[PDB]
C-alpha cells in the first residue's frame, strides 16, 4: 500500500547505529564488488543498500583504475542492508554511473544513468520494467542524487543536474508516478549550484540538501510540494557542512565562497530553524564524520552549537553521506523517521592502491539514549592486488 | 494467468539499456560459469538469463578447450537477469548443448538437447518435470533456437533443425502445450536454410528471424499461426543482417549468396514493410553492435535507413544476439514489448586464451529519448589461467 | 496433501537425462563440498539432492583422508537437483555418515546415523525437528539406504542393516509416521545379505532392491506391504546386477557366489516378471553404467535381454546408483514415475589423490524416444591440493 | 501465533545430536566469517544460528588480532542452523560485540551492543526496525546474554550486566514487548555475579543459569515471572558447572570461591530439585563437554549424579555453551523441548595462530536412546594465514 508521506519528521535527540557491512575487510578474501556511491532505501517491508559497482571485484586486477567515475561497466545493484555487496547476494537494478531509487509503497522505482558524458540517458524502471527515459538537456554529464528519492502519496520526486561542475549549471526537479515522468520544472537559481541532492519527505513536502561544487562550502537546499512549486536557499549555519570547507566561523545565507569549490555528498535534516548537520571532521579531506544539532542553523549565521555525536573519528576514512527515511507504514510510529548513511571510501586517491572502493555504516534517529564513537572501515591497505 | 499473445508488437523509436552482467570481468576472481549462447526470457513476474554452461568455472583449468560446442558436460541453467552466472545463484534446468525456454504465463517450459551428434535428443520439461522428448530425424546434430520460444494463449512454439550446416537441411515447427508436443510441421523450403531462430509473438502469430549458415548473408524468416500454417521468406533489406556478410548494397528477397556461408545467430523486428535490424558492425567478425531502423527493409531491397543506434563499438567483441518480449501481463502495456540481448564472446578463437566464454548486455525499445554508445565486455585478456 | 502411493509404476521404454551437476569439475575452483553417497528425493513441489558431506571443501587440506567412510564431521545436507553442493546453496539436514530421506507429501523425513561404529544411533527428523532415535542392535555399524525411503498413504518405509559385511548380518524394516517409528520387523533371511536398499513404492506396496556384500553377485530384494508382511528373493536374471560380478552366465534365484563378496549400491525396477536393471559396465570395478530391460529377468534365469541403453561409457568412472520416484501429485500423471541417479566417484582409491568425492547424473523413465551416450564426471585429476 | 510459553519444560533422559556446521574446516578455503559467541534461537517456523562476526574472513589477514573481545567491526548476524556463517548465506541483524535474540512467535527481536567501554549502547530491533535503546548505566562494559532471550505470551525477557568483571556489579532484568522495553528491574544481589545468562521459559516463568566471573565456581541463577518478580541463588550441586572450577566435592548454595574467579558462559536445566548440568570436562581450561543429571543438584550439595553423557572429548577444544528451546508451536509436542549448543573455540589463546574463531554443535533432549561420543571442531591448525 502506497506511502502517505504526510507526517512530520520525528524530532530526534541522537543517533543509534543500524548497520555496518565491513565490505572492504571481507573483500580482501571474499567475492565483493568494488563499489562506490552507495545508499540506502527502505520499502514498507525491507531496507536495502543500493550501490554502483565498478563491474569488478576487490583484490582482482579489473579493479585497476577504478578511481574513475564513469564507464560502461558501472551498474546499480542492491542487497539487504548490512550485507557485503556481492555477485551472490545482489539484485540487479540498472546500468548506471549515477543513480537514485525509492519505493512508493507498492513498487521499487530506480533511476540509472548510462551513456556518453555529452549525451547520457536516465533509465527509469518501475518494478524492474523500464517506464521512461530522460536525455541530457545540457549535454554535459546528466547526473542525480546517488541517494534515495522521496515518495509522497504515490508520487516520487528527484532532482537532476546537467552542466559544468565548476560554474552555473542547470537543475531540474522531477515528479514521477509509476516510473512515468509526469511533470518537471527548471529551478531558476542564479549563482546556486546543486548536485547529489539528499531528499526526504516531511508533511507532504519534499526538502533536499545538496552539494555545491562551484563555490559553496555550505550546502544549498531546495524544497517543494507535489506541484513542484519550489523554494531555495543555503543552510545559514556557520558550522559548514561541505568538504572542503573553512574552519567554522560566521556563515552565510548564500554560498560561502571560501573553500567552496569541489565538495562531497551530504545531508542535513531541517526542524524549524534548527538543523541536524552531518559532516566530515576534517575540513580539507574525506576523514571523520560527526552529527551536529544547531537549533538556528537553517536560517541563523552564527556557529554556536548544542549537541555533537561522533560517528567516524578524525583519523579515519569517510566519504559520501545521505539521508534515508522510514515511513510510519514500515515503522508503525506516528511520524517519518530520519536515518542517515555514511560511505567509507578506501583506496585512491588518498591511499596507495590501484583501486577505489567503499563500505557503509548507517544510523537511525531516536529519542532514547545514544553514544558517540568511531565506526571506521577497518581494512589494512594496500591489498594483495596492489603489490 | 496464461499469456494472451493477442496484442501487437510495440512501435519503438530507440533502445534503452536494460542489463549488463559483467560476467567475464567478475569471473576473473569470482566463481562464474564458462558459458556461451546466453538468452533472456520473462515470465509475468520476472526476467531471466538462460545460458549453456561448459560445466566449468572461469580461470580454472576446466575451462580448457571451451571453444568446443558440444560435450556431455554442458547444462542449461538460468539466473535473474543482470546477475552473473554462478553456481551460487543459478537454477538448474536441463542437460543441453542446444536449448530454448519460455513461460506460457503459468509455468516455465524448457527444451534441452544432449546426446551424440548422430542422434541427439531434445528433452522438454514443464515446471522442471520431463514432459516429452524428440529424437533427431536426420541424424545430423539436432539443434534449436538458443533463444526464447514464443507463447500465445497456452501454446508455445519453437523451431528445430536437423541436417547439414553447409547445405540443405530439414526444418520443423512445433506447437507445445504444457510441455507436450501436440503438433509439428516440416517446412517446405528448398534453398532456404534456418538455424538459431529468434522468435516472438505478434498478434497471435509468431515471427522468426533466423540464421542462414548455408548461402545467405541476409536473414531467413518464417511466420506462422497457431495451426502452424507458415510463410517463408528472406529479409529483403540491403543492410545485410548476418555475419559474415558483404558490404551493404542492393538486397534480395531470396538468400544473398555473396558471403552467405557461415553465420551468427541474430534477430529482427518486423513492422509492416519496415524492419528493426540488430547486427554486427564488422562484416567479417563478431565485432560491434548496432540497431538499424529500415522503413522498407522487410519488403524493399535498398540499403537506405533512417535510424542507427550504436550498441557496441566497432573494435570491441560481440557475438550472438536474440529477441525477447515483455508481455502486457508483465508490463501493464497494451502491446507486446520488443527487447534484445547481445552475447559478448571472449577468448577463443579470436583471443590468446585456453577458453571461450561470454558476457551479456540487453536493451528494450522505447519511444522516449535514447542514446547510442558502446557497452562492451571490459575484461582484460588473457587471464591468470592462460599464462 | 499426502502422497497416495496407490498407483502403479509407469511402464517406460527408455530413459531421458534429467540432471548433471558437474560437482567435482566446478569444485576445482568454486567452493564445493567433498561429498559421497548422494541421492535424489522429491517432495510434491521440488526435487532435491541429498549428500553426505565429509565436512570439507574440494581442493583444500581437509579433503585429506576423505576415503574414510565414517567420522564425526560427516553431515547430511541438501540442495536443489542438478546444482553443485556447496555451503552457499545447501541446507542442513542431520549429522550423518549413513542416511535416508523422503517426503510424505506434507513434510520431509530424514534419517541420520552417526556416532561410534560399535554403538551407532540413527536420528529421525520430521520437518527438521527430531522425532525418534534408535540404537544399534548388533553393535557393528548401523547403516541404511543412502537413497530415498518410499512413502505410501502418510507412512514412510525404510530398511536398515546392522552387523558384519563379510557374512551374515541382521536386517529390519520400519514404518515411520510423522518421524515416529510405529512398527519394525526383522527379516528372516538366513543366507541372504542386504545393504543400502533402493526402495520405491508401487501399487501401495514397497519393493527394495539391495546389495549383497557377503556372497552374492546378483541383487537381493525385499517386497513388503503397509503392514510389513514381506517376501524376499534374488533377481534371477543372468544379467548380474551387482559389481564385482562374473561375466554374464545363467543366473539363480539365490545369491550368485562367483565374485559375490563386496559390492556396490544399486537399483532395479520390477514390472511383472520383467526387470529394468541399472548396473556398472565393468565387472571388476566401478566403471561405466548401463540400463537393461529383461522382460523375464525378475524370475527367469536366462541371460537374454531386449534393450541396452548407454548411460556412462565403460572407461569412465561411475559408482553408486539408486532409484528415485516421482508421484502423480508432483507430475499430474496417472502413475508413479521411475527415475534413477548415478554417483560418479573420483579420487581414491583408483586415482592418485588425497581425497575421494563424487558428482551425480540422473535420468527419468519416459515412453518417447531416447538415445544412449556417455555422461561422465569429466574432471582432470589430480587437483592442486594433490600436487 | 505468538508463543504461549505456558507449557512446562519437557523432561529428558539424554541428548541426540542436532546440527554441526563444520565452520573452521570449511573456512580453510571457503568464505566463512571469523566469529565467536554463537547461539541458536528458533521461531515457530525455523531454527537459526546467531553469531558475532569479527568483520573478517577466516584465512584472510583481517582475522589478525581477532582475540580482542570488542570492536567497531563486530556485528550480530544469523544464518540457518547448521550452515556455515558466510557473507553469502547469512543475514545482518545489528552491530554488536554483545547480543541476544529471540522470536516471540510473530517477529525476531535482536539486541546488539556497541560503542565505548564506558558508554556502550544496546540497540533493540524488532523486525529489523530500531524500537528502543538502553545505555550503560555504570560505564563499565555493558553486556548481555550471548544466547537466546526467552519469550512468554507476547513478552520477551532478557538479562543485562554493567560493572566490574572481578567484583560486585549491577544486574538488571528486562521485559520487552515488540522491542519496547516496558519494564526493567535491578536485582538486589549482594555478593552475587551475573553474566551471559542462559534463559529459558518453563510454565510461564523464566529460569536463567548464568556465570559468576567474580568469585563463584558454581553458576548463579535467577528465576522470575512476567511481572519481573525474582528469586536468586547458586546451583547447589557439588558437581560444578563453571570453568575454571575446583575438584567436584561438597557444594554450596552461595558462591563457591575456589577457582571462583573468571569463568565461561554456560547453561543448566532445572527439574524440580533436579538439574541437567552442561559443563566442560576440564577444570582449568575450555576442553571437552559433558551433560550430567543430578536428581537433587539444584538444592542438594552432594556430588552424586545419575547420568553423564560424553559430548566433546577432553583432548578437544570446547568453549561457550547455552540453552535454546523449541516451543510447542514449532514441534507440535505439548511441552517446551530443551536443547543446547556448544561453541568450539579454535585459535588463540590456546593455539599458535593470529586469529580466534568458533565452530558449533547442537543437541536436543530426547527420551529414546542416545550415545556418548565426541563431535569436536575438527579443523587442522595452523592455517596458511598463520605461516
Ligand atoms: C556523475 C559523477 O561522476 N559524479 C561524481 C562527482 C562529480 O564529479 C562531482 O559532483 C562534480 O560534478 O564527484 C564525486 C566525488 O567522489 O567527489 C564522484 C561522483 N561519481 C559518480 N557518481 N560515479
Ligand atoms: C549445436 C551447435 O553446436 N550450434 C553452434 C552453431 C552451429 O554449429 C552452426 O549454426 C552450424 O550449424 O555455431 C555457433 C557459432 O558460434 O557459430 C555455435 C553453436 N554452439 C552451440 N549451440 N552450443
Ligand atoms: C555405513 C558405511 O560405512 N557404508 C559404506 C559402504 C559399506 O562399507 C558397505 O556397505 C559394506 O558394509 O560401502 C561404500 C562403498 O564405497 O563401497 C561406502 C559406504 N560409506 C558411507 N555410507 N559412509
Ligand atoms: C562484552 C565482552 O567483552 N564479553 C567477553 C567476556 C567478558 O570479558 C567476561 O564475561 C567478563 O566480563 O568474556 C568472554 C570470554 O571469552 O571469556 C568473551 C566475551 N566476548 C564477547 N562477548 N564479545
Ligand atoms: C496522513 O495520512 C493518513 C493515511 O492516508 C491519513 O489518514 C491522515 O489523514 C493523514 N494524517 C496526517 C495529517 O498526518
Ligand atoms: C593497472 O594499469 C596500469 C596501466 O593502465 C598498469 O601499468 C598496471 O600494471 C595495472 N595493474 C594491474 C595489476 O593490472
Ligand atoms: C493522494 O493521492 C490522490 C491521487 O489522486 C490525490 O487525489 C489525493 O489528494 C492525495 N491525498 C492526500 C494528499 O493525502
Ligand atoms: C485478446 O485481446 C483482447 C484485447 O486486449 C482481449 O479483450 C481479449 O480478452 C483477449 N483474448 C483472449 C482469448 O484472451
Ligand atoms: C590446456 O590444454 C592444452 C592442450 O590443448 C595445453 O597446452 C595447456 O597447457 C592446457 N592449459 C591448462 C592451464 O590447463
Ligand atoms: C595428508 O596426510 C598426510 C599424513 O598425515 C600428511 O603428511 C600430508 O601432508 C597431508 N596432506 C595435506 C594435508 O595436504
Ligand atoms: C496455554 O495457553 C493456551 C492459550 O491460552 C491454552 O489453550 C493452554 O491450555 C494453556 N496451557 C496451560 C494453561 O498450561
Ligand atoms: C598481525 O599483527 C601483527 C601486528 O600488526 C603483524 O606484525 C603481523 O604481521 C600481522 N599478521 C598478518 C599476516 O597480517
Ligand atoms: Ca563545495
Ligand atoms: Ca550466412
Ligand atoms: Ca557382491
Ligand atoms: Ca532373460
Ligand atoms: Ca567462575
Amino acid at each position: 500500500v502506497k506511502l502517505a508521506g504526510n507526517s512530520s519528521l520525528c524530532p530526534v535527540s541522537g543517533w543509534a547505529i543500524y548497520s555496518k557491512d565491513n565490505s572492504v575487510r571481507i573483500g580482501s578474501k571474499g567475492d565483493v564488488f568494488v563499489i562506490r556511491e552507495p545508499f540506502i532505501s527502505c520499502s514498507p517491508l525491507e531496507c536495502r543498500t543500493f550501490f554502483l559497482t565498478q563491474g569488478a571485484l576487490l583484490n582482482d586486477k579489473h579493479s585497476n583504475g577504478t578511481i574513475k567515475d564513469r564507464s560502461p561497466y558501472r551498474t546499480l545493484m542492491s542487497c539487504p542492508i548490512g550485507e557485503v555487496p556481492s555477485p551472490y547476494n545482489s539484485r540487479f537494478e540498472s546500468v548506471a554511473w549515477s543513480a537514485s531509487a525509492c519505493h512508493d509503497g507498492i513498487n521499487w522505482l530506480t533511476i540509472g544513468i548510462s551513456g556518453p558524458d555529452n549525451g547520457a540517458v536516465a533509465v527509469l524502471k518501475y518494478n524492474g520494467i523500464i517506464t521512461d527515459t530522460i536525455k541530457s538537456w545540457r549535454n554535459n554529464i546528466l547526473r542525480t542524487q546517488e541517494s534515495e528519492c522521496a515518495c509522497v502519496n504515490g508520487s516520487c520526486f528527484t532532482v537532476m543536474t546537467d552542466g559544468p561542475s565548476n560554474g552555473q549549471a542547470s537543475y531540474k526537479i522531477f515528479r514521477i508516478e509509476k516510473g512515468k515522468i509526469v511533470k518537471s520544472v527548471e529551478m531558476n537559481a542564479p549563482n546556486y549550484h546543486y548536485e547529489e541532492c539528499s531528499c526526504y519527505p516531511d508533511s507532504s513536502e519534499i526538502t533536499c540538501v545538496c552539494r555545491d561544487n562551484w563555490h559553496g562550502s555550505n550546502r544549498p537546499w531546495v524544497s517543494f510540494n507535489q506541484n513542484l512549486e519550489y523554494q531555495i536557499g543555503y543552510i545559514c549555519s556557520g558550522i559548514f557542512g561541505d568538504n572542503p570547507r573553512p574552519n567554522d566561523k560566521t556563515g552565510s545565507c548564500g554560498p560561502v565562497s571560501s573553500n567552496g569549490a569541489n565538495g562531497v555528498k551530504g545531508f542535513s535534516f531541517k526542524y524549524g530553524n534548527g538543523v541536524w548537520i552531518g559532516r566530515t571532521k576534517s575540513i580539507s579531506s574525506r576523514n571523520g564524520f560527526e552529527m551536529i544539532w544547531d537549533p538556528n542553523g537553517w536560517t541563523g549565521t552564527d556557529n554556536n552549537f548544542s549537541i555533537k555525536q561522533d560517528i567516524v573519528g578524525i583519523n579515519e576514512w569517510s566519504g559520501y553521506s545521505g539521508s534515508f527515511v522510514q515511513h510510519p507504514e514500515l515503522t508503525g510510529l506516528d511520524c517519518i523517521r530520519p536515518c542517515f548513511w555514511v560511505e567509507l571510501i578506501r583506496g585512491r586517491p588518498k591511499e596507495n592502491t590501484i583501486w577505489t572502493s567503499g563500505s557503509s555504516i548507517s544510523f537511525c534517529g531516536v529519542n532514547s539514549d545514544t553514544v558517540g564513537w568511531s565506526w571506521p572501515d577497518g581494512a589494512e591497505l594496500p591489498f594483495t592486488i596492489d603489490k
Side-chain angles (χ1 to χ4, degrees), chain A residues 33-170:
Chain A
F33 290 131
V34 180
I35 66 138
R36 254 209 68 208
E37 295 89 34
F39 65 88
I40 296 181
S41 191
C42 296
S43 79
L45 294 194
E46 60 166 345
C47 287
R48 296 185 73 75
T49 309
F50 285 83
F51 45 86
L52 309 176
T53 73
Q54 280 282 11
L57 309 199
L58 282 169
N59 236 348
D60 181 83
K61 63 161 177 198
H62 298 96
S63 62
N64 206 6
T66 59
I67 189 171
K68 214 186 196 296
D69 281 318
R70 308 167 298 277
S71 72
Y73 318 120
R74 297 207 76 156
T75 73
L76 166 83
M77 312 187 78
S78 64
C79 57
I81 181 169
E83 300 181 26
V84 297
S86 175
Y88 317 138
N89 69 13
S90 295
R91 203 211 277 153
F92 167 84
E93 304 299 344
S94 231
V95 187
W97 38 251
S98 174
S100 173
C102 46
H103 197 291
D104 58 14
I106 306 308
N107 289 115
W108 278 112
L109 152 78
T110 72
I111 304 149
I113 299 184
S114 207
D117 285 334
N118 65 345
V121 160
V123 179
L124 299 104
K125 283 186 193 194
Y126 192 68
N127 197 29
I129 306 296
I130 298 191
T131 46
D132 214 330
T133 71
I134 166 67
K135 212 190 146 91
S136 185
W137 69 89
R138 287 295 200 255
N139 300 93
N140 179 6
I141 305 162
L142 175 54
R143 56 198 183 261
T144 186
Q145 296 189 249
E146 335 287 16
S147 150
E148 76 167 6
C149 44
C151 291
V152 168
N153 199 30
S155 295
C156 300
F157 306 73
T158 187
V159 198
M160 280 187 191
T161 300
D162 204 340
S165 55
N166 66 332
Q168 184 75 66
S170 165

Side-chain angles (χ1 to χ4, degrees), chain A residues 121-331:
Chain A
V121 160
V123 179
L124 299 104
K125 283 186 193 194
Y126 192 68
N127 197 29
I129 306 296
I130 298 191
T131 46
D132 214 330
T133 71
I134 166 67
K135 212 190 146 91
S136 185
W137 69 89
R138 287 295 200 255
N139 300 93
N140 179 6
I141 305 162
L142 175 54
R143 56 198 183 261
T144 186
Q145 296 189 249
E146 335 287 16
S147 150
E148 76 167 6
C149 44
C151 291
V152 168
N153 199 30
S155 295
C156 300
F157 306 73
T158 187
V159 198
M160 280 187 191
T161 300
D162 204 340
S165 55
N166 66 332
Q168 184 75 66
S170 165
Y171 330 112
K172 293 180 173 194
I173 311 177
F174 302 83
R175 180 212 194 145
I176 308 138
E177 296 167 25
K178 305 213 171 293
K180 203 70 200 173
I181 296 164
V182 298
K183 191 185 188 178
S184 55
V185 59
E186 198 179 328
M187 285 149 52
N188 184 74
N191 260 74
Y192 286 74
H193 200 264
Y194 291 86
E195 267 170 352
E196 306 176 341
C197 296
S198 261
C199 301
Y200 63 85
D202 184 7
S203 292
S204 303
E205 314 253 319
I206 312 307
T207 299
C208 308
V209 178
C210 309
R211 170 177 172 177
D212 184 327
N213 219 78
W214 178 15
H215 59 193
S217 35
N218 51 326
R219 295 187 180 287
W221 58 268
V222 51
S223 56
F224 50 91
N225 54 23
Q226 280 150 312
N227 303 327
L228 309 181
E229 296 157 21
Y230 65 94
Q231 282 215 1
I232 63 172
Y234 276 85
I235 302 171
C236 284
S237 178
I239 308 176
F240 308 118
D242 203 353
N243 181 274
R245 64 179 187 262
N247 287 327
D248 290 335
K249 42 144 176 155
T250 293
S252 187
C253 286
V256 171
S257 87
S258 344
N259 288 305
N262 309 313
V264 78
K265 174 177 169 61
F267 67 94
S268 287
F269 294 113
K270 171 188 177 286
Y271 300 91
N273 278 289
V275 62
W276 267 106
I277 298 173
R279 74 171 189 172
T280 72
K281 287 187 161 288
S282 161
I283 68 158
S284 65
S285 75
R286 290 142 181 205
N287 317 98
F289 204 81
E290 50 190 26
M291 293 290 297
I292 307 187
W293 169 250
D294 182 18
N296 43 79
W298 196 266
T299 55
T301 45
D302 74 86
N303 66 5
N304 301 6
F305 69 80
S306 289
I307 317 180
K308 190 198 261 181
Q309 190 183 12
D310 287 354
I311 295 305
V312 168
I314 183 80
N315 299 335
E316 291 282 344
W317 304 109
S318 68
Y320 274 17
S321 50
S323 60
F324 75 95
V325 295
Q326 307 182 322
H327 288 252
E329 286 79 2
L330 174 80
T331 185

